[model samples]
Target: GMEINADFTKPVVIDTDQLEWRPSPMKGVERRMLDRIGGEVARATSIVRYAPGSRFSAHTHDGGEEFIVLDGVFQDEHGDYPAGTYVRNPPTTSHVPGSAEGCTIFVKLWQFDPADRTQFSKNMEAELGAPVEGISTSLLHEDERETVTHRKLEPGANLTSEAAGGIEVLVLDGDVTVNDEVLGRNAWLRLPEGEALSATAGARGAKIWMKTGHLRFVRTPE
Candidate 1:
């Protein structure tokens, strides 16, 4: 019964600096929520931080999990995921995720197709192919519901996309301007269905994570 940035009909932008870090149910873990549609366990997007030697109890992801390691390393029964790693644990998968050396990550919860069984991880930067124009990209995951990608842009380059079912963008480094507002590292942006995305990189260019065509599947747990 909680809703943070719950409206999907309007575009939203959140600079990480404007958010407050709040403790999670687990000790030594904190999060800055970007959006939420339920209580403690919910359909959510957040920047999570784990302190050194911290560990979260094992849990099942009934609706799946997707994350990009932003700093340090994240560990689980699967393996260790260092910065720039992109991971997806499909619905029904389970893990005890934490960090021994501390870390920060951009994570999304309960936002996958219930029938999805594909689970994998990859280093985003290492997976990138050659640049086309001013941008280089690595496709992280794609299905009927959404397409996820990690990208690096050359300075002053433009990123334009046709997002029929809506789109989400997270700035990982450098800066970008969308609708005249500059977004720095960790900034989040969500554009409603039918609203195409058009943004420009700043002087230093940018590293970004983007997911498109998923808003049509948005739902909060029952």
Candidate 2:
């Protein structure tokens, strides 16, 4: 099992502004990868930015993709999604993603195998449920096989999860304490398979993107 404590040495800090932006074949779109777990951790993640009036060609995701709109508005054939939209595009699904008012998103690409077969879209404001006593959780995607939930910890609230497969988290708001360390926005932490987590929020509440599922392995290039 892999476990990542909320330590500076272990957490990946990616300053989007400093990273090299790769131009897309599609006009007015740029992308940058923050963490690539291919061969290393069996997953891949990136931060994508789009300029107003920019659009990409229709393409299919071979291994599936998921995205969270961080700023502005993201649009596709289905509809226009504003910030805070979370979408899961199953493998082999195709779409033309664009932005008319400019946008930035946190995207995980090529993490699902063709056989996984799970698809959904969740608008946090609409689909999320009320906060629990100490831990407020929003069910994003869940099934018999895997569960993806967004959890928010109010100040002084603590949470513990049952032992499960690989657990990964991205700090989206405020500060949180994992074990002995604290994490702020944009920070990432990963726990090896079967690891347990004990976390507490700071003075202000904290929101996080948390997931537990079968790890997706990216084969190494021969």
Q: Return the top candidate by TM-score.
A: 1
Worst 10 residues of 1 by lDDT: 33-42
Question: C-alpha displacement of 208 in model 1, angstroms?
Answer: 0.5
Candidate 1 on 2-87: residue-level lDDT in tens? Answer: 79889999889988877889998889989998888876669999999999998778999998899999999999987799999999
Model 2: colliding residue pairs: 1-192, 1-193, 2-191, 2-192, 2-193, 3-192
Model 2 residue 140 CA deviation (Å) reads 0.7
User: Per-candidate RMSD vs. true structure?
Assistant: 1.2, 4.8
What's model 1's lDDT at 89? 93
TM-score of 2: 0.80
Q: What lDDT does model 1 reach?
A: 0.91
Candidate 2 Cα errors over 4 Å, as ranges: 1-27, 37-43, 216-222
Q: Cα lDDT of all candidates, in order?
A: 0.91, 0.72
List the candidates' TM-scores in order.
0.96, 0.80
lDDT of 2 by residue, 45-134 (tens): 777789998877788877778988888999999989888788999878889878889998888766665676777778755655666766
